[PDB]
Amino acid sequence: PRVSGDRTIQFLTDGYLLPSNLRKTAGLEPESMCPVTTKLLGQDATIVRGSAGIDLFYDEDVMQREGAMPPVIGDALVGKGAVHNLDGEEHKVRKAQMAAMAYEDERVAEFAPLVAEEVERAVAGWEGAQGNVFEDLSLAFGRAAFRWAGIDLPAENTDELVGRMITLLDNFGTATGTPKAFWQRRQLDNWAEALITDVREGRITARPDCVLEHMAQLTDASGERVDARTAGIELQNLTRPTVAVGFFASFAAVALAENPQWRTRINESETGREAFAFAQEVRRFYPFVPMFPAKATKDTEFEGCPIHQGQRVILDFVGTLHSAEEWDNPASFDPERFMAYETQSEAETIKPFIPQGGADVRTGHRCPGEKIAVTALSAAVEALARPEVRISAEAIDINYSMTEILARPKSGVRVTVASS
Ligand code: HEM
Ligand SMILES: CCCCCCCC/C=C\CCCCCCCC(=O)O
Ligand SMILES: [Cl-]
Numbered sequence: 559p560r561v562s563g564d565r566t567i568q569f570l571t572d573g574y575l576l577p578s579n580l581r582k583t584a585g586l587e588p589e590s591m592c593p594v595t596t597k598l599l600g601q602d603a604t605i606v607r608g609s610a611g612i613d614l615f616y617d618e619d620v621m622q623r624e625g626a627m628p629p630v631i632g633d634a635l636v637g638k639g640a641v642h643n644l645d646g647e648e649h650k651v652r653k654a655q656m657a658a659m660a661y662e663d664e665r666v667a668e669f670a671p672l673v674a675e676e677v678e679r680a681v682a683g684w685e686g687a688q689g690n691v692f693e694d695l696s697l698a699f700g701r702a703a704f705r706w707a708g709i710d711l712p713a714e715n716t717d718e719l720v721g722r723m724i725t726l727l728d729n730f731g732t733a734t735g736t737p738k739a740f741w742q743r744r745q746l747d748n749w750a751e752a753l754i755t756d757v758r759e760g761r762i763t764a765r766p767d768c769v770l771e772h773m774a775q776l777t778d779a780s781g782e783r784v785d786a787r788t789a790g791i792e793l794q795n796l797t798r799p800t801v802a803v804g805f806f807a808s809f810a811a812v813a814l815a816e817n818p819q820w821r822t823r824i825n826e827s828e829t830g831r832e833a834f835a836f837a838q839e840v841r842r843f844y845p846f847v848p849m850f851p852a853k854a855t856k857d858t859e860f861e862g863c864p865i866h867q868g869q870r871v872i873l874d875f876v877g878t879l880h881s882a883e884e885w886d887n888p889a890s891f892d893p894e895r896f897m898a899y900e901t902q903s904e905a906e907t908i909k910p911f912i913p914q915g916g917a918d919v920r921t922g923h924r925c926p927g928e929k930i931a932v933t934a935l936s937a938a939v940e941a942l943a944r945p946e947v948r949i950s951a952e953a954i955d956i957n958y959s960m961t962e963i964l965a966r967p968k969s970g971v972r973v974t975v976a977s978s
Contacts, residue, residue, distance in 0.1 A: 577874035602869035607877035637768035637791035657926040686977040692970030696804025708768025731963035750790025809844035814917035835896035884910035
């Protein structure tokens with residue numbers, strides 16, 4: 559199945575609708591698991607979804623990531639030289655050091671009380687006042703992430719830096735926004751490089767064993783220190799994605815407005831199980847990652863479709879999370895799907911549940927921050943569910959576009975907390 563011509567421009571016009579539009583234009587039936595091939599950025603790109611597509615995408619014998627993400631997105635979103643761009647043993651060494659920070663249960667346990675405290679502070683700010691879920695909980699997540707990582711700055715400086723991260727996250731995916739995103743990336747990289755250099759030179763003392771110390775000690779496969787700007791880029795890759803949970807928190811507020819019986823169950827629970835299941839089904843249901851790219855390292859073949867060395871293979875995330883072959887009633891928002899699961903580690907066993915990537919965290923490129931992200935999102939769900947939180951139901955607060963990346967309600971979701 560092929561779609562003719564170069565469809566690069568259609569990525570910007572279609573956003574999250576791009577993969578299902580191309581499968582339709584190719585003549586596939588709805589719910590087909592067949593790959594579809596088009597041209598993007600002057601080369602072939604084959605779009606795959608579902609369990610077999612996951613197995614292909616994460617097969618590092620045939621897939622590489624260097625050069626897969628277009629720089630206009632990647633250099634703004636994750637920065638130059640980031641772990642996302644690495645392959646092979648160098649990738650494994652860098653990823654081990656980053657997963658040691660984000661993915662270890664004891665470090666997650668350190669994050670949990672910090673994010674609960676910052677969420678509670680944001681929500682207290684809504685009392686008798688006009689709050690904004692996206693802006694205020696993204697800020698709360700960023701404050702928690704800096705405290706968690708051992709980045710110790712005056713409150714005004716932290717808020718300003720977290721604000722730059724929000725501006726970057728809110729703008730990197732559009733034609734109008736990309737100059738703003740690249741401006742913020744420049745300032746943040748200068749800031750993080752200066753901080754790493756200050757730690758390495760002894761001008762700033764980092765808490766022993768904190769994330770900041772470990773990023774200052776970041777080394778490559780030969781044992782040599784990574785340069786200071788790259789280390790600062792990796793420090794941002796362990797703090798900015800926590801800020802980005804604000805997108806899921808905005809959707810969670812929408813979902814709580816739309817699912818008042820689940821909201822009641824969360825408020826009446828003693829266990830946190832409903833809030834966890836609700837947070838997971840927010841990550842399954844709402845659009846965040848549209849798709850993600852890799853490049854073939856050698857000629858190969860996938861379900862009768864030839865895959866040429868150097869072409870892109872694009873895993874369609876929305877189409878996997880919403881595949882009727884992989885899920886029962888995928889268009890239904892239903893936290894019961896996850897009520898039998900107790901931890902994020904257990905949720906990893908669900909093969910098509912890939913909101914932050916698939917396969918294995920330490921041996922592949924899968925996100926190492928899902929435990930942090932579910933911790934932050936669950937804290938948000940529990941605080942947003944409380945009955946004194948009044949979530950706006952106006953159209954600009956509830957609806958979101960599928961044709962712009964990233965997606966969120968235009969207003970950010972307006973909220974207030976009832977007060978006496
Ligand atoms: C809104 C929340 C988040 C989303 C939607 C998200 C999504 C993703 C996705 C799609 C990938 C690429 C997976 C692949 O290449 O196959 C990824 C990788 C990564 N994420 Fe997350 N993430 C989030 C939160 C976090 C958090 C909280 C952290 C750390 C504290 C984090 C750190 C990373 C890192 C370091 C990588 C690169 C891993 C590698 O290439 O080996 N992310 N994330
Ligand atoms: C031709 C290449 C086609 C592939 C284009 C892929 C577009 C990907 C768009 C957005 C990726 C979102 C990644 C998740 C961001 C949140 C975590 C973070 O801050 O790093
Ligand atoms: Cl299911």
